[PDB]
Design a binder for this molecule. Structure first.
Ligand SMILES: O=c1ccn([C@@H]2O[C@H](COP(=O)(O)OP(=O)(O)O)[C@@H](O)[C@H]2O)c(=O)[nH]1
Ligand SMILES: O=c1ccn([C@@H]2O[C@H](COP(=O)(O)OP(=O)(O)O)[C@@H](O)[C@H]2O)c(=O)[nH]1
Ligand SMILES: [Cl-]
Lengths: 391, 373
DNA sequence: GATACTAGATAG
DNA sequence: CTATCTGAG
């Protein structure tokens, strides 16, 4: 009903899914007639702060020394949406003032908390999440069976209702901006996008390239594999690769019989353009079923929306439920290739078929785009969330 | 016996440690009967070029358009000492001519290369380091032979050492640069929690402006900034924030330090970069007559030149600043500020220890012998 | 195969 | 502070 919305990332602007969600959320609220202020605590900085285009509208605030500025911001809205909380690495002043903010927000402001993390390992790396949840008037999580719901919430309430949510994207806009004529897509390029955490399936991508793609003369690119501590393991296993920074992308060896070409971190818009011209995009996220309900990740949606053939993790499609009828995603003729770890041959065979038949290729991606649109477009999902928020 | 030495700073004259080493090296060679020419590439300019007194003899050359001039200079010596190489921010003409230079000097010239960098991050900003190693006849590193950047400690004392009666015990002077391992955050902290409340004053010289100040501000650290122009407007009275000087003239700082109760050099060098090498700012404190306050782990990681034992295992008169127990550090400082006799006793100790550890008379002799045979 | 997941230092 | 590089809990 035409309200003022303050979207708050108290952990900081990290540049990944929480930042992307906040940006898509802002867009939806603006598109639907509401006013939005996007605020983030800058007490902690992150590598991917520039990955998304937010600087022309985001408002940074140092919780440690600008409590007053933060307080006026969060209190100048009708609905306060908190998508992240301070990390366990911040100084006492930061968590102290954050907690102080929670206590001094007008009682009338509707506080909505979205928990974006899955594993308890990540959930524990938060400070003030308990007081955040206690002040929340509405709470969303990615799964009724996840650690947030089954571990933390039971720990705090031995209780408010926790609603499920999917992180939506304006899939129409992405396509309108990057979709390419199939004739301009290089069937030899296989592009994986993700992060350096085991459940993103980087090991499986290296394995698939070594056993099927490389031998078949194809090229593999992996974007987003930052050299964080987790990357140490890739070095210890002795996996072959060629690493490139963001200022040396054009110096990437995209010829056959080459190791996987790795990119550190990417600018979202630049990646979408490269992907729109890539034969196959890979998103191998493979979370434990307990974390899956209806949520695909932004990288899943980005593949389908930009026009490449999406290659997803089978068990992920099997354990996720289509938004329209709650049926497994794998039960639909979506055009998506469900990467099978125990049978990569069939996976590569499907890829071969598509690579040699532009018509079949085009038909299949059109199916993927419409399937993904129906499943997680902002026009549907944010409306569901809005109804729950204003319930 | 006497020889012609050309000291070449191909990166340019930055005005810090490499520049200081080059000038001290020139002094030692000249002092020991050798002819010296000091050459530097002016392709890249720097802020602290005038920090050290070199204009009366230094020879600038633009590698990009004075190759012939450069070639005749570096070829006009018996020993060529290369103390720095071109930065990656130089135009192709600069590095191209530098490599060409290495390939055209007489094969008979002894080329000595000194690697002053510590972290690999500083190394990756060096060009032509490949061909430099190839042409090099002798190579030195801080931690291939090891070396310590020596200074003529006795000469500094002789020029600035003041009677304890002339020293202001309330002044705490930190010297360094705007890079976290120089320990400026610890100095700010120490002033806030111990020095300021005790009515003491703190001056921090060398903190050049940089993006790091964005972080200093965000942390809400109080400070008053001064350019080398209005050093006269510096408020040294009690109850003041740390007083910062952006850049300093070496000779001027030594004079200021010689009259300061305590000098601080809080560089924290990971044990990997530490072997025997202290920095010039370390030596400068002990040489001008102030009480040196150094970083504890730095002294624990470094080995004394005389017997290879940790510096901290000696009764050196040096106050080892302990981030984990700053109160004890402050109590040590108070103790010395109260008894001028004890104060004099400790610095005399510091001077002799530092002299024995890294005076040019010892270190440059050691390096010359390595260079010779 | 914890492939079960997720800093610290230094230069400009 | 951001970008970049080493190599952990
Ligand atoms: O270096 C990177 C890494 C990620 N992203 C984007 O950040 C979002 C990450 O959301 P997702 O839920 O897919 O992954 P996660 O939040 O778990 O990293 C997606 O829009 C990615 O395209 C980006 O622009 N650059
Ligand atoms: O603004 C400044 C900064 C430094 N120095 C001098 O430059 C040298 C720096 O060498 P050091 O090894 O102490 O540290 P670096 O700056 O080379 O890492 C010392 O003689 C300092 O006194 C100076 O004269 N002015
Ligand atoms: Cl220098």
């Amino acid at each position: 009903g035409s309200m003022r919305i303050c979207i708050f990332m108290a952990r900081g602007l990290e540049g990944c899914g929480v930042t992307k969600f906040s940006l898509e959320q802002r867009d939806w609220f603006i598109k639907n007639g509401h006013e939005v202020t996007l605020v983030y605590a800058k007490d902690k900085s992150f590598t991917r702060t520039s990955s998304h285009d937010h600087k022309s509208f985001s408002i940074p605030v140092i919780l440690a020394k600008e409590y007053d500025k933060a307080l006026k911001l969060v209190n100048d809205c009708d609905i306060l949406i908190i998508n992240s909380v301070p990390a366990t690495s911040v100084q006492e002043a930061t968590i102290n003032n954050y907690k102080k903010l929670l206590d001094n927000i007008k009682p009338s402001i509707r506080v909505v908390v979205y928990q974006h993390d899955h594993s308890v390992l990540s959930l524990r790396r938060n400070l003030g999440l308990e007081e955040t949840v206690r002040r929340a008037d509405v709470i969303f999580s990615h799964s009724d069976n996840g650690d947030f719901n089954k571990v933390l919430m039971k720990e705090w309430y031995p209780a408010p209702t926790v609603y499920n949510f999917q992180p939506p994207m304006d899939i129409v806009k992405v396509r309108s901006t990057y979709w390419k004529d199939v004739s301009e897509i290089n069937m030899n390029i296989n592009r994986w996008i993700g992060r350096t955490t085991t459940w993103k399936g980087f090991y499986q991508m290296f394995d698939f390239h070594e056993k099927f793609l490389k031998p078949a003369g194809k090229s593999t690119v992996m974007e987003g594999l930052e050299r964080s501590p987790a990357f140490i393991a890739i070095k210890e296993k002795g996996i072959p690769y060629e690493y490139y920074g963001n200022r040396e992308i054009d110096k990437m060896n995209l010829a056959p019989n080459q190791p996987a070409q790795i990119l550190d971190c990417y600018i979202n818009s630049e990646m979408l353009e490269r992907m729109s011209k890539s034969g196959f995009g890979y998103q191998l996220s493979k979370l434990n079923q307990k974390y899956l309900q209806r949520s695909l990740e932004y990288t899943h949606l980005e593949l389908g929306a930009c026009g490449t053939i999406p290659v997803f993790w089978k068990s992920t499609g099997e354990n996720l439920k289509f938004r329209v009828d709650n049926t497994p995603l794998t039960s639909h003729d979506s055009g998506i290739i469900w990467f099978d770890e125990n049978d990569m041959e069939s996976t590569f065979e499907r890829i071969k078929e598509l690579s040699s038949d532009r018509a079949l290729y085009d038909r299949e991606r059109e199916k993927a785009y419409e399937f993904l649109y129906q499943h997680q477009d902002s026009s549907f999902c944010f409306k569901e969330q809005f109804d729950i928020i204003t319930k």
